[PDB]
């Protein structure tokens, strides 16, 4: 899975897609939660490839977003679409990021696909098929 290595690269990545969701994982490869998440993101990448591209960002090597994206969870996954952060209601109370090892591969595809169809349709907000409380 591709990595972004500085702020400029992250900006380039977001600006590189017209018709796909850019999924970013902020964290650390050596981190346990990020390993679980990275496993899932890896195995579903082929499937989401017409509507989604995934990148990893280490938030020590690339600290630029730590304060504003509030990256205080070990593993954060966030969604972008034509340069707009897209939100998902996960029934968690936090609509800006998925911040846990979301173990179910098919569920991740569903969420990523929902975000894509929503963001294309113009919503800045969609809800995950499953409630996660």
């Amino acid at each position: 899975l591709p990595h972004l290595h500085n702020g400029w690269q992250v900006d380039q990545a977001i600006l590189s897609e017209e018709d796909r969701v850019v999924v970013i994982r902020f964290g650390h490869d050596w981190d346990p939660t990020c390993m679980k998440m990275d496993e899932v993101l890896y195995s579903i990448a082929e499937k989401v490839k017409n509507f989604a591209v995934i990148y990893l960002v280490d938030i020590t090597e690339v600290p630029d977003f730590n304060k504003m994206y509030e990256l205080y969870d070990p593993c954060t996954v966030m969604f972008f679409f034509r340069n707009k952060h897209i939100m998902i209601d996960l029934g968690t109370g936090n609509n800006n990021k998925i911040n846990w090892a979301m173990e179910d591969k098919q569920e991740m595809v569903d969420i990523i696909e929902t975000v894509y169809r929503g963001a294309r349709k113009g919503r800045g907000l969609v809800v995950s098929p499953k409630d996660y409380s």
């Binding site: 569920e107 349709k121 499953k130």
Partner: protein, 66 residues
Amino acid sequence: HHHMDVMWEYKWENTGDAELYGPFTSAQMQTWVSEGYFPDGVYCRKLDPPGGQFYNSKRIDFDLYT
């Protein structure tokens, strides 16, 4: 145009014995929602792929698939 369009099936209660209803188009499902047929929601899913869990339709936006 290569794939069969998205198709839905539901049940009224989320169990293994409950009765399955399908298949319906996304616009069919969306009609039934915006007309009161599922006030307390139903447990529905997409038929493709056939390995699927059921989701409460209240959390589903069918107008995304139409």
